[PDB]
Point group: C2
Chain length 139, copies 2
């Protein structure tokens, strides 16, 4: 209903990364659900994102190589990661297990976006960042 955040991801990053992150976010009083937003190989990413944005104040995608390869049909994936509906907005994409070269091939525009990187940032740091935004902290 009044969910704070949803996490779009690929099936491969669900238990490896998304679940601990969702639990860590729950520890900071952040309502987050992800089970229904796993991206299957034949699923439509746009449909999933708009559905989640209807019921969630904020959104984010876990960008891994699997993610961009799964939905082969997506040309303009760069626009999706900042999609906004009602007073809900998609924020802070998470570059998870992806290469700069891969991003350059599929969506070059994605390179110049505000994002988080799990190679340089831990789950706790990433959760604190998302919690800073969602909880209107230092503002």
């Amino acid at each position: 209903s009044e969910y704070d955040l949803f996490i779009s991801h690929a099936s491969e990053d669900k238990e490896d990364f998304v679940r601990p992150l969702a639990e860590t976010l729950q520890q900071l009083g952040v309502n987050v659900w992800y089970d229904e937003f796993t991206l299957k190989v034949g699923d439509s990413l746009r449909q999933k994102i708009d559905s989640g944005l209807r019921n969630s104040k904020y959104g984010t995608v876990v960008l891994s190589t699997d993610f961009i390869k799964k939905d082969w049909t997506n040309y303009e994936l760069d626009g999706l990661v900042a999609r906004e509906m009602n007073g809900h907005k998609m924020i802070l994409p998470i570059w998870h297990k992806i290469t700069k070269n891969d991003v350059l091939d599929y969506s070059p525009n994605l390179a110049d976006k505000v994002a988080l990187n799990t190679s340089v940032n831990s789950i706790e740091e990433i959760a604190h960042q998302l919690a800073d935004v969602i909880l209107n902290r230092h503002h």
Copy 2:
């Protein structure tokens, strides 16, 4: 003190995806590079592979992916292997490929604040220029 300029240790999953194009680029920049025999399969000995590569290669490097660290279950002290020195050869510039900060923190915490390359922030050509600068004293 060897014939080959560089060898690349990697996991089986990054061989054709990453190590192959990177080695191809390195050869385009005049660096004798071989990686084909240094794939780390499950149950393999990382130390044995690294020492073997250092026998015939001036320099070495490891492609750190989550897969790579998962391979060697017997590897407790992985921090030392990525700077191992044998004869007059040294292991240089680890390449963080498809890894998490948490994953690295779990297996070898000392590596987290060590000089490395990141395939998420740097392209293959970008990474090869750094590698070739060091190996060829440019």
